[PDB]
């Protein structure tokens, strides 16, 4: 067979430097273990400094922090500060009462 | 001797399903691999049973005739092998692989 | 910012049931492929010849092949050896 699963091969980006270890399975496993959504902050409005309560009439943004059934995600998952989690939950509950979410 | 080893290698089943009394529930029929010594025992017993249906009073003569027929293609024990392999193909998913 | 959770002082640092990886037997997988090969191309089909030859060699002496059929975890040995050093406990 001339095919390998993507999970068993690492694609080295262009312009990057590499070591011989980058072709091993240890690199594959190490990349899975340390795979965190750290790029969310730059794409996370609520981690930028905006007040989440200003989005109470914008269900599309709020729908990014609820599960498929509408259950607000725990702070352990959202990664927000206590204040933003507190404000975001208020926004979602207000949005639900207005008839938008 | 070469004829005997060829017949034993063609008649013996590669795998055989065995019932394992795993759990209080019904036992599982899982295909198991067979080694060469275990394969020869299964094939030899089939040959002996086939041989003892022949007319000669001497076991050597009946065995000789049976071995000659197997070396010439004709044997009723190839059906047994096909039925042991069919069962194993059916239970291929029951294998554990760890 | 990621919340660090610090444990209280503990009588031990131990994993109840350490997870050990157990590699699959090469003879069992060879058998699992041959059985599938017969399921598609048919029993004794000439396409599964190599599978049959490989299975016979794998199982010739031991039906499960010669294997390093042992593996134990050492996490509890190291966890008990290093706990006092790394727990960050204040001085006496």
């Amino acid at each position: 067979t001339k095919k390998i699963d993507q999970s068993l091969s690492k694609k080295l980006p262009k312009g990057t430097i590499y070591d011989p270890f980058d072709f091993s399975m240890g690199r594959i496993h190490l990349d899975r273990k340390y795979q965190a959504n750290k790029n969310s902050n730059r794409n996370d409005i609520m981690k930028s400094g905006a007040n989440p309560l200003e989005f109470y009439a914008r269900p599309r943004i709020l729908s990014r922090y609820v599960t498929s059934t509408g259950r607000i995600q725990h702070r352990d998952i959202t990664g927000l500060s206590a204040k933003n989690q507190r404000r975001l939950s208020k926004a979602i509950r207000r949005c639900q009462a207005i008839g938008l979410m | 001797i070469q004829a005997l080893e060829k017949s034993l290698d063609e008649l013996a089943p590669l795998m055989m399903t065995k019932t394992f009394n795993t759990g209080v529930a019904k036992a599982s029929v899982i295909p198991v691999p067979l080694n060469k010594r275990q394969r020869n025992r299964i094939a030899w017993n089939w040959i002996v049973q086939s041989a003892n249906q022949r007319v000669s009073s001497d076991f050597a003569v009946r065995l000789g005739e049976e071995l000659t027929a197997i070396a010439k293609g004709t044997s009723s024990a190839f059906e047994k092998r096909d039925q042991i392999h069919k069962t194993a193909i059916a239970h291929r998913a029951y294998i554990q692989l760890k | 910012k990621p919340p660090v959770y610090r444990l209280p002082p503990l009588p031990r640092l131990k994993v109840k049931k350490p997870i050990i990886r157990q590699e699959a037997n090469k003879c069992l997988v060879l058998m699992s492929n041959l059985l599938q090969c017969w399921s598609s191309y048919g029993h004794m089909s000439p396409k599964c010849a190599g599978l049959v030859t490989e299975l016979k060699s794998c199982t010739s002496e031991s039906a499960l092949g010669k294997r390093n059929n042992v593996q134990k975890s050492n996490i509890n040995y190291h966890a008990a050896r290093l706990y006092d050093r790394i727990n960050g406990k204040p001085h006496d």
Binding site: D5, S9 | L97 | -
Partner: peptide, 25 residues
Amino acid sequence: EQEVLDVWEKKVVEETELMAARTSN
């Protein structure tokens, strides 16, 4: 790199055969 890529070849083949059998289930 060859030393590493040789061990990687073996494991890939092994893990591309356990998957095929395990998926057959």
